[PDB]
Structures are given as C-alpha cells and as structure tokens.
Design a binder for this molecule. Structure first.
Ligand SMILES: NC(=O)C1=CN([C@@H]2O[C@H](COP(=O)(O)OP(=O)(O)OC[C@H]3O[C@@H](n4cnc5c(N)ncnc54)[C@H](OP(=O)(O)O)[C@@H]3O)[C@@H](O)[C@H]2O)C=CC1
Ligand code: SF4
Ligand code: SF4
Ligand SMILES: [Zn+2]
Lengths: 177, 137, 388, 355, 45, 118, 144, 147, 123
C-alpha cells in the first residue's frame, strides 16, 4: 500500500520562534547548549588576517583586556582553528592567500571583520590595489566598525558572535529536518 | 588585589545571593554602594576600597541574563568609563538636555528582526510620464 | 655545485609584525640568497594623496605605521610649513616634542618587545603593553582616538591640551623607569639573549651608509648621526638629551641603543612637562589654520576662512621639498611637490623599513633561520610602511 | 566593460505587468530588475544557480533552514542582492513571503532519501503543491520546476513515482509551469557520483555496474536554468537535459580509476542483501544510501523524445571524459617521478652533504 | 609620421584607443565669478 | 494600509508605520519619498523584520510650528541658538533678522520666529 | 630574572572585566555618529555640505532642497561606516554642531547593510545619546 | 640638474670627492610632467653624515628612454629603482633584477602616471563556479567624486 | 651585495634589431620549454599545447612593432613575466588571467551585430 496522502501540518513555527515542549526537545536543547558552551568557551582564531591594525588586536591580548580569560587563543595554523579575523587592508595580491586559509579551516567556521578597511575598504576604497570589502572573497558573520576599532569594540563583537553561536541549532534542526 | 581576604570580606559585605549572582555574571566578587538604576533596570555601583585598582571602582549589574553593553542607557555609558564624576541621577537640571520629544531607548537589535533596515529617503530623480491618450479628431 | 632549496617563510607568519612573503634559498641551514617580496599590504597611498587637500591627506600619514603615528604626521606638518613659510608657536612646538617622545617610547616598546616574542620571551611583551596602554590614555585625551589620531597638523596642533594632563604624565614618568628596569633585568645581562643577539646582523659603517640605513642600525656601527641634533626641528634644540652610540653593529648593540632611547626620552618628557609655555598651539593666521568657533559664530571673516579651509583648503606655494626627521625606526622623510593648488602634485614617503628590508639580503647571508628572525626583529619593520 | 550575457535586451517586461529596466554593464553593481526565489540554493545545484543569477545583479531570495550552510551564498553578489528568509514547508506564510515579490520562482526541493519528518511523498508532491498554490495565488509570472530524470508516475522506484506526481500536480495547478528533467549531474563536491567513486572505500551494485545513463556537468544545467528563467518561450514546456554520450556505470568507474591512477574497489553483491544493509543504515543520523536507490540501480535512463533539449537553448553540453581530469586531479596521489635512470650522472655533480 | 606608440607599453587597455574620445579645452571663464586663474591650463577629459 | 506591489500583488502594512513620522503623515519636501513608495520598492528587505523597532524619529517641521513666536522692539532681532547653560558657543552663528514687515520672520538656521510686537 | 618574574606573581593584575567595567573614555572620543537637534525639536543640519567635502573617505552623501516652510534642510544624509575612518573632521567643520561623534563603540552587526546609516538612523541616535553628547560638549567646546 | 648620461660620473664625484662625501642614498623618485617632451624626472636625494648636508640630483627620461643605474655604487638603490619602475615605468639600465615590487604580480599598468585612473581598470571577486579569485572590469557602487 | 634572483637578466638596451631578434627568440624558447612547469606549478585544467598556443598569440600581438626602444621594453617586460611564472610567485588567478577562453561560455547573447548592441544599449 504505497503512500498517497499527507498529514503535513501547517502553522509549524519557524526555528527562531520554536519553543520546546517535549522531552526530546529539552534533550536536544541540552545537547545543543553544551556544544555551544564548548564553542563559546574555546574561541581560537588563526594568526592570519592580522596584517594592518594588528596593534589594537594585540591590545586585546594584553593585560587590561585579556582575551585568554574568555578562552581565546591565537593559533599559527588554520587546521586547529575555527575563527578568522580579517583585520587590515585586504589587497588584491593577498585575497587568494586568504581564501586558501579559509578553505583550509575545518567546519564549523566563522568570520569576523575587524575594521573599516576590511568591511568596505574604508579609506582606500577607491584605490587600485584593494578589495572593496572582504565580503567579496569570504562570508562574514560579524562586522566590527572602526579604524582602528577599540579593544572594547572587538570584545563586544566577540560577545555578539558568542551570542550567534549560542542561539544556534545543531541537533534541533536535525530533529526538524 | 587578587587576594582571598578581598573576596571573603566582600561576601560578608554583600550577601550570598549577590555572591552567586556575581559569580554567575562577572566572575569576581565586588561590593560597593549603589548610585542608581537606569530606565532598562541596570544598576550601577561604586567602590572606595584601597584594594581596587584604577578602572575597577565603578561597575554594573545587568538585569537580563543575556547581558550586552548596548543595554546600558546613555549617561551611564559615559559615567561608566570615568568620563564624569557625577552620575545622571545626580547631575543638576540645567546640565540636562531639554527634549521636545519623548525618550525611547532601543539597544543594538542586530541578529534579530528589529535590525535596522536601510532605505533611500529620496525618490527617483528622473520622474517618468504616466501615459494618457488622445484621439485624432 | 650547490643546488638550493627555496622555502617561503610564509605570508601567514605569526612572528612578523605584519605580512611578508620572504623567499629564502637554503643549503642546509645557511641562507645564501633572500628575495623579500612585498606589496601584500600596499594600499596605494601616494596616488590617493594627489586627489586630496593638504588637510584631508594628513590622516594618510598616520596609517603608514601601526605605531609611531604622531611622528609620521610630524613629518608632513614640517614639509608643508616649510612650503607655506609659516612659523609654529612655541607651545605647539613643545607639545609636538613631548608627544614625539611619548611616541618614540610607544614604538620602542612594541619593537623591542616583539623582537623578544619572536625570540621566545613572551613575558616582556605583556609587561610593556600595559605601559603602552597607560600612555594611550594620554592619546585619547588629546585627540580622541587611541592609536590613529591626527593631532599634529600643518601649522601646529589641532586643539590645546586639556587640563590635568601634565600631572598624569608626571605620574607615569616617575613610575616608568622602574618598569624599564624590570625589562632590562630579564633581557640585558642574560646569556640566551646575548647568544641570540651577539655577532648577528652585523653590519659595517660603510655598508650601512651605502645601503641607506639610518637610526639605530647606523648608530650601532659607530656613527653618531641623529637628526634631532644635526638638524633640530621642533624644540629638540631647546631641550637636553644624549645620543647613544655602539660598536660591533650587532643586534645586542641596537637593543642597548633602544633602551637608552627609552630613558633619554623620559628625560625629555620630564623637561617639557616642567616648561610648557603659554600661548597658542596653532598658527594665528586663519588663512592656514581654522579659527576658534566663538569667532566663526560671531565674526564674518573667520567664518569665511573656516568655509574655505574646510572646502577648498589652503593654497601652498609652488615648490618642492624633502624634509626628514629622526623617527624611531630611522630617518623618515616626505618628498612633496606643489603646483600652487590645494592638492599635492606628488608625495613620496621615504620609509626606513624599505631600505632595511632591502639590505636584509646583504645582512642575512651566512646566517641561520633563527638569526633571520632576530634580524627582522632588529629592524622591527612595520610592513604597512614597507609597502608604502 | 562587463556584459549582460544572460539578457538579450535591457528593457524586459514580465507576464505579470512589471517593467524591469537594466542598469549598468553587468557587474557586481548592476541590476537586472528581476527578483527570483530559489528553494534549494543551499544545495549542490542551487548554489551554482544563485551564483549565475546574482553575478549580474538579479535579486535572489534564498529560503533556508540551517543558518550556517548558506553563508557561502552572500559572497555571490553585492549588498541587497541576496536576501535570506527562514522557511519551512509546514509553514505557509513563509512561502508566501518568499514568493510574493518574485518574477521568477525555482523549485529545487527534493531529497534522495526519506526521513522522519518528510517521506518522499511529502517533499516531492505536497511541497510542490504548496509552492504551486502560492505561485498561483500571487500569480507569479514564471515557475521552473526541476523533476528528476526517468520520472514516471508509477514505477518500481518510489522516488520517480513521486517526482512524476510532482510534475503533474505542478502542471495541473500552474499551467504555465516550466519543467526541467536533468539526468545524473556531476561536478565538484557532487553528492553520489565522483566524490563517491573517488572516496568511497568500496562500491556495490545490486545489478552489475550496468545501469545506463547520460550524465551532465552541473554548471551547464545551471546555465540552462539561467537561459530558461529569462526566455518566456519556455512556458508550458518540458526539457530533457541528458548529455551527448551514453555511459554505463562500469565505464565511468574505469575512467575514474584510470585518471586517479588508483584501483577503485567494486564488489557487486546481490540485491536483497544490499537492500537490507541500506535499510539498517537509515537509522543513523547522517545521509546514506536508502532502500529505494538500489532499486533505481536497475532503472536505466529512458529519455523522453517529445521534450526540448540543450540545443533548443544554444548550448553545447560537455563530455565526462574531458572533465574527469579537472574533477579528480585532487584525489590523484601522484606517487613519484617516472624512470629515475639517466639521472645518477646528473645528480653526481651536485653537493648532497654539506659539512 | 613617426610618433611613437607608447600605447603598447602603457599597460592600459586598448578600448581607450579604439572606442573612446577625449576633449581638450580650457575651462571657460565662470560667470558666477570674475577670476581667471582656473583658466590658462589645457584640461583633458 | 494595503500597498499594491509592482508585480500585481499587495503589501499590507499597519497604519502606525506608513506615517512619515509619528507626529506627521505627509512629506515635508517634494523629493521626499513617502513611506508607501519606500515599502513598495524595498519589501524584500523588510519582509521578516519588525517595523516597531525600526528608527522612527519625530519631525522637526511640526515641533517648531508649536514653538511660540517671540517679539522685539525694533527692526532687528538677533538670534544665536546658544544654550546659556554650558560653556562655549554650542549654537549657531549670529543672525540679525529684519522684522519690519507685517508677518513673522524666522532664522534661517533655526526656525524660531520673531515679530515687531504686533 | 626569574625572581623579578616571581615578584610580579604577587602583584595586582591589571585586568578589567569589560562588559561590567568599561575602560576610560574622553569627551574628545570619536565613535558612532549622530545628528543632533535644538531644544526646540528642530534639526540643526542645514546642508552646508562641508562634512561632505572635507571627509577624507567620501563616506557622506547629502541631497537637500527647499522645505515646505521655506527653509534649507536635508532629505538625504547617509554615512557608510565601512568607509569612515573616524577622523572627526566632520564634527569640526559643522558651524552648528549638528553632526557629532559619540563615545559609543558598541554597534557591531551581523550585516554590512546595517552600517549604511541614513538620516533616520542618525536622528534617533542623536535623540538617544543627547545627554552624553551634552556632557562631552560642555567639556570639549571651549577647546574646540 | 643633469642628463641621463651624467648620472654615474656625477655620482662618483659626489661619493668620492673629499669636500662632497655624499655616501648615503636617501631616496629615488620619479615625477610625471606630461607637458614636457620628456615627461619623467628622476630625482636622487643624497646625504653626507660627514659634513652634515643633503643634496639632490635630477635627470629626465621617457617611457622608453632608460636611465643608468647607480647600483654600481649605492647598493640601496636596488629597491628604490624597482619601485620607480613599478610606479612610473622608468627603466634603469644595468639593474641586475628589475621587476615589480609593490603592484600585483600580473598588474598591467603603471599607477602614478597622470593618465592612470585612481581606481584602476580591474577588480577581484570570488567566483563560486570556477572556485577562483577572478579579475573583472571595474564597477563601483559609489562613484568617485573629485571636488 | 644584493645579488640577483634566479632567472634574472640584467636590463640591457640593445642598439640593433638584429640582436633583439635573438634575445626574443631565446625568450620564446624558454617559455615553451617551461610550459609544462607552468602546468604543474599552477593547477591547470587544460593542455600544454593550449599554453603554447597562447604564448604564440602573445608574441604575435607585437610582431609588427618596428620602433626599437618599444621592442626593448616589450622584451624586458616579457622576461619579467617569465621570471614571475617560473619561480612560483604568481598564484593561479594571476596566471589564468591569460586564459579567459578556457573558462566556460559566459552566457548566451554575446552581441556581434548592431541590432543586438542597440537592444542592450552597447552601440
Ligand atoms: N544532483 C543530481 O544528480 C540530480 C538531482 N535531481 C533533482 O534536482 C534537485 C537538486 O538537488 P541536489 O542538487 O541533488 O542537491 P540537494 O538534493 O542536496 O538539494 C536539496 C535542497 O532541497 C532542500 N530540501 C530538501 N528537503 C527539504 C525539505 N523537506 N524541506 C525544505 N527544503 C528541503 C535542501 O535544503 P538544506 O540543504 O537546507 O537541507 C537543499 O537545499 C533535486 O530536486 C533533485 O531531486 C534530479 C536528478 C539528479
Ligand atoms: S569623522 Fe568619519 S564620517 Fe566624519 S569625515 Fe571623517 S571619516 Fe567621514
Ligand atoms: S556640516 Fe553640519 S550642517 Fe553642514 S551638511 Fe554637514 S551635518 Fe549638515
Ligand atoms: Zn536662529
């Protein structure tokens, strides 16, 4: 008896507004919350992308604003990292190297654009030797404004990114799919 | 100071409920007088102890569990930051801006539907013609 | 036949204070050839400046070095005053001096303490960056911005000092010698620092001159050249200081010179704080410098001048000039050309890190890779400068 | 300068009464006027499609369910071009939102396997009906369904049965619907073809590797959908995008092995055992072959000769044996150099050991 | 003739040479002002 | 409000969000785009978004018509929008308005009006 | 050297907790932009377009026309904060103190189109931060 | 002011003569004056730490007429002449390895020429299809306003 | 001394066409011998013959240039590009700038007569 009907519900709420009410739902919420706790408390960017305006990023590694207190560690290599920070000017002589480093990163992976020269080209927007935005190469999740963005702006941007991953659905979406 | 006597004396000063709240929010224990609360409900304190270095005298205690510094009302965002010695709660009257319009504080709604949508306040510069026809009488 | 092995040091290098594709050719460990590639960060500054007024272009010169902003704009201010044929007021000269030395401190800190970290000593870095972050509060107080600022402008200074700044500077100054000494304790007399810096990057006097090298790279060979003494510009003639010099031309001597420059700059800061004359901080010719606002909102000619300076800008006389300074990196310079317009016709930034990296091939030949790291660290090239 | 290689004119007019004036030369900043909607741009084919649409400034509405698979689409165009909505076939308002302001609609929905929330029927029939009813309500000018090759209303394969029912329902609500019927697509990061023959430890065929088909490069099918979205001659039509050369499974595998210089592993164990092993692997959460696909291993490609083809769009579809090098060179191991002899005498001149 | 073709070494496209027109001129004396300094130079646009 | 899209469909938007500002419906300048033409041209980017939380500041053209007229004895009124409370200028450049003519006269910077006592 | 290291182990760390304790901020600081109003409720911008001319990055984009009441005012005022370098030349040129730069730095986003600020987004930002702007102006104007 | 033939001789005099020990090479720079027949004007700056003095030295060139290289004397001129070539197109005869240093590896053009537009002729984006950073003709979303 | 890199030739402006003929021919020969290296180093998706075809096209471009100085400039620029390519300085993008043709057909309508250009406003 081959299927030839469908009880497909309407009015099924969307993921943003999907509250839990079943034990499977609370369970998947707990597993997602733990995975996201892991993703938040260990937030390791790669040393690449920090060309120009590295001073303000190094000041977030400094005493007054310790990034390591949030579990941030900068790594030499993509393969161990999750996050890329496209600080500074993204020139046309460098974009392919950037895309290599981004494809080399293992999923899950995010991107956070620190500064104006990397968001929309900023000051050198009309130059011959510039990518007018790092969007053109890689997909960006958070845009920090500034030139050079204050250490506090970078920390706040990381606290917006932690929020993005914290309201992420890893298993609940599979229970939808 | 980073010494244990600091946290112990502070936890004697402010009670255990505030201790677990501070441990779940700040990560440190801190005790000080209240200076006032903003329109979002966020409370702002100040310390006088010698143990607290520069830039740690004034602190916040957010209301929402999903805290974000965008939730801090103006004035406080400047007092919290050592821009002024006098808080908006005690700043005199003539120093307060006059408003012909109501106040309405709205945080950074990024990542949520209320994110700011941009648009063009103008209309197309070259207005075209809306056809109408005539007959060859 | 020695056949070589080409390796990239990497455009993605944690150690370098910036991005550099260094193509080395090795026969085992020894370097025999080096081909530093650059332009990975070249933004195109020298062309864009030709489309901007002399005021709109000042911000360009602060982005040419991640550190050392207030000196980098002090070169453009001097060139354009030399063309305009105006004179800066005394208080502006003393401020430009004091902030020039605060800036040399802020650069030598980053430089020495990045050399360390590339050589492995993680700690002096983080013991010094706090001092940098106390010194940047003075920046945010005078300019508004923490790093890239735009305080020094042709004709002097943008705005006067706020009250209660010399006091805080004096406080930091009384406490800074101790922290410099705490750094010297770890680095100076240590064995490993000497092993990594004694007879490395050794360059002779005649070679250092033929290669265009300046600054500590030259003062480590034995030549006492310091533009601040041989050609004083702001107030370095009206304030006492000494210039260290060293033999042997190695990295250790350059490190000692840099620490000596820390302490002598501290001497200068103390003196300038003890004698900051009253008066204006900017030229009193409202055809060059924007007036106050209490006049622009009450006097007609002042509002006109405000309008023109902030639309068309000020007309520099025709001419051309190379003027130079003793920037902490070396002898920085600007070659400006004028055509009677408010927009420059040409502006070449001479960048000491350029000639340093160019000599890197002459300097590294015979040395192993750890020594190449130490060499780039002696020069502490800021590759935004190197790429212009 | 750049070009509008997709458009024949600059002033176009949809069948819904909208005028669409093009602006620019056809680069990142240009605009085609159009507004489309692609229900599976997160996937293998829809990704190449949105890339080709948004390269020229066509506004692209991209319904998504996972926020993180999609981000690789925002790169494909300027700001404001690519627009995202969270959607689900079990919510109707979401579908009306996605299709409201669209001149074009593109349905790429369909899994190669069943799930707990979606059987083959619910996703290939009911989902098509929901989208069709919204395409009809709002009277969208164009609708471009994609229904799998070999589709037939009643067939041993439930997949092809549903795919055939999705065809007739779409065309019985939206008469002006265009239907495309691609054959097995191949390319970089493909689902079940070259990445599998190049990565899978061992292949299996309940038949022999004998199922006959005409495969095709996916970029060309994306070119086809581009050349159909804008050509209004293709209403109430049907297409068979199959490809010039007929290839049996064993032929493809031998070319894959030749190009890879590694011996691909194939087993050829019978039907019921493989069908059972697939059925038991459908309980783990990750996609794997499903009982209905080994059923399709016995169903070679019957081509419908009454439907249009590539040559009705001025296209020259590509050949597998040429492209396999580009697609499989990454897995090429390239063990070492050939025939090191006649190199001792040359190596003898160089210094191999320094002191 | 014998005017060198630096267009070959300029590194620029050829569309400027084959399809694009320039105009050489002096800026007209503005009527909104009475100055004449912006003149005396032959612009190319 | 129900706004007809170009593609023949409709665009429903509530009345509180079609007003050009919370104190004024109409546009105060010929080139200003009315909120309906804005939505009708940009709903792709407004679709799943909340209009309550979008910026909707008050208009000044209506808050300055409410301000009472000021009066003076003479053919001149001087204006300088100075705070008088804090230091510095903090206002707009001095402007001497002629007020001999029968009606009110407004400063060109701020719209404050002045009259000749009648 | 190791003992000089240890003495630091027993000394006060410099670290502050950012979201609960912010770092020093000055009236001269240059962060987010804002368009102010008079106490009357009218806006201060008059489309002198000096901010559009001196801006190094050419971020600003303005278009004015005669308002219905016969005054000079704007219908478009945009800022691309992805072009802005935060120089403060725009708060220096304005002869009415309309455009300003707030001490706010907490305005990061998930999209690049939330950073193309328009007039309405700036007028609300100035309605919001007016008290902070008054503090900074009352202690910065005399030097400016 | 000199001519391209006179560069090596005068530099030898300025490097070796006792009264003029201009041993250090501070800079090399070209400048574009299209109104001239010889549009380019190469500029050497020099320094004498001995006597504490600077001096300049100007020549002229064209897009095809080269200039002698003073790498025979001042090794630091290597990079500066590579710059002036890449920026303006001037050819420094005798140079051991003259190649671009700043501009992109395949860049076609010389930027600081007055005929070269500010923005250049090309731009780069990621093509998801080809999976490659690809160079396309320029198109800006906000055009350059000169003022 | 700052020594020259691998395949560097000193810039030397020949006074005659007869010598530059030889130098250009050596450059062409080196490009051809090195084309397989240009296929290995850059992950190329086409033939070595197609590379040699493009090289022949690029040399036919300036085949009819009789001004000697311009020829010297062209030869120097070509040696620069050979040095850029054979040493692995260029990446794939900067190399496939020279091979637009190999990439897939960009769309359908590529105007070649007037009327299509007019309908696309390119005339
Ligand atoms: N690729 C091939 O070889 C062939 C493909 N086809 C047909 O062409 C289309 C191509 O898809 P393909 O390229 O194979 O890559 P996919 O099949 O992975 O594309 C699947 C898309 O459909 C979406 N989708 C699937 N099920 C649902 C659902 N239940 N509700 C909502 N969205 C859903 C997925 O969204 P998400 O990714 O977010 O889960 C994904 O975007 C399919 O219709 C397929 O049947 C036909 C013959 C051969
Ligand atoms: S301060 Fe910012 S907005 Fe103002 S001119 Fe400078 S870059 Fe532009
Ligand atoms: S300078 Fe001030 S008044 Fe003039 S246009 Fe800019 S914001 Fe408006
Ligand atoms: Zn007034």
């Amino acid at each position: 008896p081959r299927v030839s009907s469908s009880s497909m519900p309407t009015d099924f709420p969307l993921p943003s507004q999907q509250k839990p009410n079943s034990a499977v739902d609370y369970t998947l919420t707990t597993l997602d919350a733990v995975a996201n706790w892991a993703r938040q408390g260990s937030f390791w960017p790669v040393t690449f992308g920090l060309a120009c305006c590295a001073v303000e990023m190094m000041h977030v590694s400094a005493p007054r604003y310790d990034q390591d207190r949030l579990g941030i560690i900068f790594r030499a290599s993509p393969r161990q990292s999750d996050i890329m920070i496209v600080a500074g000017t993204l020139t046309n002589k460098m974009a392919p190297v950037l895309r290599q480093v981004y494809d080399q990163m293992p999923e899950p992976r995010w991107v956070i654009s620190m500064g104006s020269c990397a968001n929309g080209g900023g000051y050198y927007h009309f130059s011959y030797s510039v990518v007018r935005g790092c969007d053109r190469i890689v997909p960006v999740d958070v845009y920090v404004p500034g030139c050079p963005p204050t250490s506090e702006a970078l920390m706040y941007g990381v606290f917006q990114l932690q929020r993005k991953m914290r309201n992420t659905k890893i298993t609940r979406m599979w229970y939808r799919k | 100071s980073s010494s244990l006597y600091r946290v112990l004396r502070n936890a004697w000063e402010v009670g255990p409920r505030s201790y677990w709240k501070q441990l779940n929010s700040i990560g440190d224990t801190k005790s000080g007088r209240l200076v006032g609360t903003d329109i979002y409900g966020n409370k702002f304190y100040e310390t006088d102890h010698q143990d607290e270095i520069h830039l740690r005298t004034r602190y916040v205690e957010y209301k929402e569990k999903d805290y974000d510094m965008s939730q801090v009302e103006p004035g406080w965002h400047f007092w919290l930051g050592y821009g002024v010695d006098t808080a908006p709660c005690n700043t005199p009257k003539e120093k307060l801006p006059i408003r012909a319009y109501p106040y309405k504080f709205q945080p950074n709604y990024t990542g949520t539907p209320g994110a700011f949508v941009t648009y063009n306040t103008l209309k197309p510069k070259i207005s075209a013609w809306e056809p109408v026809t005539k007959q060859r009488s | 036949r020695i056949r070589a092995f080409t390796i990239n040091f990497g455009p993605q290098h944690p150690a370098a204070h910036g991005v550099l594709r260094l193509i080395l050719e090795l026969s085992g460990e020894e370097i025999i050839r080096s081909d530093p590639h650059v332009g990975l960060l070249h933004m195109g500054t020298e062309k864009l400046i030709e489309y901007k007024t002399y005021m709109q272009a000042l911000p360009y010169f602060d982005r040419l070095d991640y550190v050392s902003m207030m000196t980098n704009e002090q070169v453009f201010s001097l060139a354009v005053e030399k063309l305009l044929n105006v004179e800066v007021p005394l208080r502006g000269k003393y401020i430009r001096t004091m902030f020039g030395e605060i800036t040399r401190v802020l650069n030598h800190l980053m430089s020495v303490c990045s050399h360390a970290m590339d050589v492995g000593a993680l700690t002096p870095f983080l013991w010094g960056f706090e001092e940098r972050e106390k010194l940047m509060e003075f920046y945010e107080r005078v300019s508004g911005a923490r790093l890239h600022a735009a305080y020094v402008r042709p004709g002097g200074v943008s705005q006067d000092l706020p009250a209660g700044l010399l006091d805080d500077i004096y406080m930091w100054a009384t406490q800074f010698g101790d922290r410099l000494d705490e750094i010297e304790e770890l680095l100076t007399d240590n064995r490993i620092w000497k092993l990594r810096t004694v007879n490395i990057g050794t360059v002779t006097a005649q070679d250092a001159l033929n290669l265009g090298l300046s600054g500590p790279m030259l003062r480590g060979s034995g030549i006492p050249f310091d533009i601040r003494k041989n050609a004083p510009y702001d107030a370095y003639d009206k304030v006492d200081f000494d210039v260290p010099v060293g033999m042997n031309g190695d990295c250790y001597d350059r490190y000692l010179i840099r620490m000596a420059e820390f302490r002598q700059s501290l001497r200068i800061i103390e003196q300038c704080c003890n004698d900051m004359p009253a008066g204006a901080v900017k030229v009193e010719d409202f055809k060059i410098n924007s007036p106050p606002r209490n006049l622009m909102k009450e006097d007609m000619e002042a509002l006109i001048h405000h309008f023109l300076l902030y639309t068309k800008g000020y007309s520099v006389p025709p001419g051309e000039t190379y003027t130079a300074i003793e920037a902490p990196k070396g002898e920085m310079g600007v070659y400006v050309v004028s055509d009677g317009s408010e927009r420059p016709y040409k502006c070449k930034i001479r960048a000491p890190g350029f000639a340093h990296l160019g000599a890197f091939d002459h300097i590294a030949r015979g040395h192993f890779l750890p020594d190449a790291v130490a060499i780039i660290g002696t020069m502490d090239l800021v590759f935004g400068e190197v790429d212009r | 300068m750049n070009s509008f290689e997709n458009l024949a004119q600059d002033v176009n007019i949809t069948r819904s009464g909208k005028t669409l004036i093009a602006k620019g030369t056809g680069g990142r900043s240009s605009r085609t006027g159009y507004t489309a909607t692609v229900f599976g741009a997160n996937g293998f084919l829809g990704s190449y499609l949105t890339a080709k649409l948004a390269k020229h400034g066509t506004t692209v509405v991209v319904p998504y369910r996972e926020e993180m698979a999609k981000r690789h689409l925002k790169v494909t165009g300027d700001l404001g071009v690519v627009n995202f909505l969270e959607m689900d076939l079990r919510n109707l308002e979401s579908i009306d939102e996605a299709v409201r302001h669209s001149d074009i609609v593109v349905n790429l929905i369909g899994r190669e396997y069943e799930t707990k929330n979606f059987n083959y029927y619910d996703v290939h029939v009911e989902g098509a009906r929901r989208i069709a009813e919204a395409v009809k309500k709002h009277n969208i000018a164009r609708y471009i369904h994609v229904s799998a090759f070999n589709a037939e209303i009643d067939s041993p394969s439930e997949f092809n049965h549903t795919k055939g029912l999705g065809e007739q329902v779409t065309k019985d609500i939206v008469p002006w619907a265009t239907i495309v019927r691609p054959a097995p697509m191949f390319g970089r990061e493909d689902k079940w073809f070259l990445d599998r023959m190049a990565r899978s430890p061992c292949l299996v065929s309940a038949n022999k590797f004998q199922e006959t088909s005409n495969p095709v490069h996916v970029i060309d099918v994306a070119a086809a959908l581009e050349r159909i979205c804008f050509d209004d001659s293709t209403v109430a039509q049907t297409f068979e995008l199959y490809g010039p050369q007929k290839f049996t499974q064993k032929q493809i595998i031998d070319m894959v092995s030749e190009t890879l210089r590694k011996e691909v592993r194939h087993i050829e164990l019978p039907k019921a055992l493989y069908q059972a092993y697939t059925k038991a692997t459908q309980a783990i959460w990750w996609p794997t072959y499903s009982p209905d696909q080994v059923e399709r291993q016995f169903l070679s490609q019957k081509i419908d000769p009454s439907a249009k083809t590539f040559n009705d769009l001025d296209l020259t579809p590509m050949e597998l044996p040429d492209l396999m090098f580009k697609l499989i060179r990454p897995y090429r191991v390239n063990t070492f150099q050939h025939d090191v002899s006649q190199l001792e005498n040359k190596e003898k001149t160089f210094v191999h050991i320094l002191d | 003739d014998n005017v060198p073709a630096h267009e070959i070494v300029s590194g620029a496209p050829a569309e400027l040479s084959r399809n694009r027109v320039v105009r050489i001129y002096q800026q007209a004396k503005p009527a909104t002002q009475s100055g004449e300094y912006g003149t005396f130079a032959w612009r190319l646009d | 409000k129900s706004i007809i899209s170009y593609n023949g469909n409709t665009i429903e938007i509530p009345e509180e969000y079609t007003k050009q500002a919370p104190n004024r419906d109409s546009t105060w300048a010929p080139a200003q785009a009315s909120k309906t033409e804005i939505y009708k041209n940009n709903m792709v980017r407004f679709e799943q978004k909340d209009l309550s939380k979008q910026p909707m500041p008050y208009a000044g053209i209506e808050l300055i018509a409410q301000q009472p007229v000021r009066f003076v004895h003479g053919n001149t009124a001087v204006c300088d929008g100075a705070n008088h409370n804090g230091p510095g200028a903090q206002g707009h450049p001095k402007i001497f308005i002629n007020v001999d003519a029968p009606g009110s006269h407004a400063c060109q910077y701020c719209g404050t009006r002045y009259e000749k006592e009648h | 050297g190791l003992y000089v290291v240890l003495e630091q182990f027993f000394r006060a760390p410099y670290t502050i907790y950012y979201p609960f304790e912010k770092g020093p901020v000055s009236p001269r600081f240059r962060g987010e932009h804002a368009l102010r109003r008079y106490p009357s409720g009218e806006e201060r911008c008059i489309a002198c377009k000096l901010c559009e001319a001196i801006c190094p990055a050419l971020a600003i984009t303005i278009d004015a026309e005669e308002r219905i009441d016969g005054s000079r005012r704007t219908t478009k005022y945009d800022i691309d904060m992805t072009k802005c370098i935060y120089c403060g030349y725009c708060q220096e040129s304005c002869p009415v103190d309309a455009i300003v730069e707030t001490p706010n730095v907490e305005y990061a986003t998930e999209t690049r189109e939330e950073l193309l600020y328009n007039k309405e987004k700036l007028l609300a930002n100035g309605d919001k931060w007016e008290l902070e702007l008054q503090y900074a102006l009352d202690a910065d104007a005399p030097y400016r | 002011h000199v001519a391209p033939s006179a560069v090596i001789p005068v530099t030898t005099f300025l490097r070796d003569n006792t009264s003029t020990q201009y041993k250090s090479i501070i800079d090399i720079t070209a400048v574009d004056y299209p109104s001239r027949e010889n549009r380019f004007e190469v500029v050497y700056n020099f320094l004498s730490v001995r006597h504490n003095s600077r001096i300049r030295l100007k020549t002229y060139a064209t897009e095809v007429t080269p200039v002698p290289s003073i790498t025979c004397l001042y090794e630091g001129a290597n990079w500066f002449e590579r710059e002036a070539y890449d920026m303006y197109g001037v050819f420094f005869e005798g140079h051991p390895d003259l190649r671009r240093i700043m501009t992109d590896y395949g860049f076609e053009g010389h930027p600081l020429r007055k005929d070269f537009p500010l923005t250049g002729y090309t731009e780069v984006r990621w093509d998801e299809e080809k999976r490659r950073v690809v160079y396309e003709p320029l198109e800006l979303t906000q055009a350059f306003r000169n003022f | 001394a700052i020594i020259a890199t691998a395949f560097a030739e000193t810039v030397k402006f020949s006074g005659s066409k007869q010598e530059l003929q030889k130098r250009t021919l050596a450059l062409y020969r080196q490009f051809l011998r090195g084309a397989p290296t240009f296929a290995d180093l850059y992950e190329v998706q086409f033939s070595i013959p197609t590379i040699r075809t493009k090289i022949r096209q690029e040399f036919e471009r300036h085949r009819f240039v009789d001004d000697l100085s311009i020829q010297n400039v062209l030869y120097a620029k070509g040696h620069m590009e050979y040095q850029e390519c054979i040493n692995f300085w260029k990446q794939q993008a900067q190399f496939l700038k020279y091979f637009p043709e190999e990439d897939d057909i960009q769309g359908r309508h590529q105007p070649s007569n007037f009327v299509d250009k007019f309908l696309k406003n390119r005339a």
